[PDB]
Design a protein around this ligand. Sequence first.
Ligand SMILES: *Cc1cccc(C*)c1
Ligand SMILES: *Cc1cccc(C*)c1
Ligand SMILES: *Cc1cccc(C*)c1
Ligand SMILES: *Cc1cccc(C*)c1
Ligand SMILES: *Cc1cccc(C*)c1
Ligand SMILES: *Cc1cccc(C*)c1
Ligand SMILES: *Cc1cccc(C*)c1
Ligand SMILES: *Cc1cccc(C*)c1
Ligand SMILES: *Cc1cccc(C*)c1
Ligand SMILES: *Cc1cccc(C*)c1
Ligand SMILES: *Cc1cccc(C*)c1
Ligand SMILES: *Cc1cccc(C*)c1
Ligand SMILES: *Cc1cccc(C*)c1
Ligand SMILES: *Cc1cccc(C*)c1
Ligand SMILES: *Cc1cccc(C*)c1
Lengths: 21, 21, 21, 21, 21, 21, 21, 21, 21, 21, 21, 21, 21, 21, 21
Amino acid sequence: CDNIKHVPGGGSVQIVYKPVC
Amino acid sequence: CDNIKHVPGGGSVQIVYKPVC
Amino acid sequence: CDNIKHVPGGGSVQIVYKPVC
Amino acid sequence: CDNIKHVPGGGSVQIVYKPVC
Amino acid sequence: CDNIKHVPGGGSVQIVYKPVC
Amino acid sequence: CDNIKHVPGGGSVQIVYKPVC
Amino acid sequence: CDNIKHVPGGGSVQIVYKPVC
Amino acid sequence: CDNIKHVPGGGSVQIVYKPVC
Amino acid sequence: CDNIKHVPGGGSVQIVYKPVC
Amino acid sequence: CDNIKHVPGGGSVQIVYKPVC
Amino acid sequence: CDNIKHVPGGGSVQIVYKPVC
Amino acid sequence: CDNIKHVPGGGSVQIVYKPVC
Amino acid sequence: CDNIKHVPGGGSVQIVYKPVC
Amino acid sequence: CDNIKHVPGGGSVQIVYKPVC
Amino acid sequence: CDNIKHVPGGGSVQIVYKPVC
Ligand SMILES: *Cc1cccc(C*)c1
Ligand SMILES: *Cc1cccc(C*)c1
Ligand SMILES: *Cc1cccc(C*)c1
Ligand SMILES: *Cc1cccc(C*)c1
Ligand SMILES: *Cc1cccc(C*)c1
Ligand SMILES: *Cc1cccc(C*)c1
Ligand SMILES: *Cc1cccc(C*)c1
Ligand SMILES: *Cc1cccc(C*)c1
Ligand SMILES: *Cc1cccc(C*)c1
Ligand SMILES: *Cc1cccc(C*)c1
Ligand SMILES: *Cc1cccc(C*)c1
Ligand SMILES: *Cc1cccc(C*)c1
Ligand SMILES: *Cc1cccc(C*)c1
Ligand SMILES: *Cc1cccc(C*)c1
Ligand SMILES: *Cc1cccc(C*)c1
């Protein structure tokens, strides 16, 4: 990804599986 | 992705499977 | 990834499996 | 990755498996 | 990785398995 | 691919070129 | 692909070229 | 790939070239 | 790959070139 | 690879070139 | 791409972003 | 890419970002 | 890439970022 | 890459970052 | 890489960073 601004102001969960970035 | 501004102001869950970005 | 600004202001979990970055 | 600014202001967990960076 | 600024302001756990950086 | 049950009961040939799975 | 049940009961040939799955 | 059950009951050939899994 | 059950009951050949798993 | 159960019950050949696992 | 014969006889510029070939 | 014959007879610039070939 | 014949007859610049070949 | 014939007949610059070949 | 024939007939610069060949 690029220039991602992930600011949930709360619970944050990121679950990925076999990605190709 | 590009220039993503993810600001839910609350619970944030991201679940991905075998992506190709 | 590039220029990621991950600031949830809370619980942060990152789970990855066999990625290719 | 590059230029990652991981500042959750809270609990931070990073779990990776067989990555290729 | 490069230029990683990991400042959670809290509990920090990093678990990796057979990476290729 | 996921949950592939390849049971031809005979000759089986799989030829792939530069895939992105 | 998902939940593929390939059971030809005979000769099976699969030829692919530069796929994106 | 995941949960692949490759049981041809016969000749099995798998030929791959520059994959990205 | 994960959970691969390769049981051809016969001749088994696997040929790979410059993979990225 | 993980949890690979390679039981061909016969001739088994594995040929790899410059992999990145 | 395959069998590309790029012969502009002049200035040639190719700019790509996050492709999936 | 395959069988690319890039012969511009002049200035040649190739700029790519996070490709998946 | 395969069988690339890059013959610009002039200035040649190749710039890549985090590729997956 | 394979069988690359890079013959620019001039200035040649190759710049790569975190590749996976 | 394999069978690379890098013959620019001029200035040649190769700059790489954290590759995985
Ligand atoms: C943007 C992004 C998030 C998680 C994993 C990847 C490969 C990319
Ligand atoms: C934008 C994005 C989110 C999660 C995963 C990917 C590959 C991309
Ligand atoms: C952006 C990113 C997060 C976690 C793992 C990878 C390979 C990339
Ligand atoms: C950005 C990143 C996080 C954890 C592991 C890797 C290989 C990369
Ligand atoms: C960025 C990074 C974190 C942990 C392990 C590796 C190889 C890389
Ligand atoms: C399902 C599958 C078969 C062969 C190659 C790939 C990448 C995927
Ligand atoms: C379902 C399937 C068969 C062969 C190749 C791919 C990428 C997918
Ligand atoms: C499912 C699979 C078979 C052969 C090669 C790859 C990368 C994946
Ligand atoms: C599933 C698999 C078979 C052969 C080679 C690789 C990298 C993966
Ligand atoms: C699953 C596997 C078989 C042969 C070589 C590699 C790197 C992986
Ligand atoms: C044909 C082609 C040109 C540039 C980039 C890609 C992925 C493909
Ligand atoms: C054909 C091609 C040109 C530049 C980069 C890639 C991955 C492919
Ligand atoms: C064909 C090619 C040019 C530059 C970089 C890669 C990974 C591939
Ligand atoms: C074809 C090629 C050029 C530069 C770097 C890589 C990994 C591959
Ligand atoms: C083909 C090639 C050029 C420079 C560095 C690597 C790892 C590969």
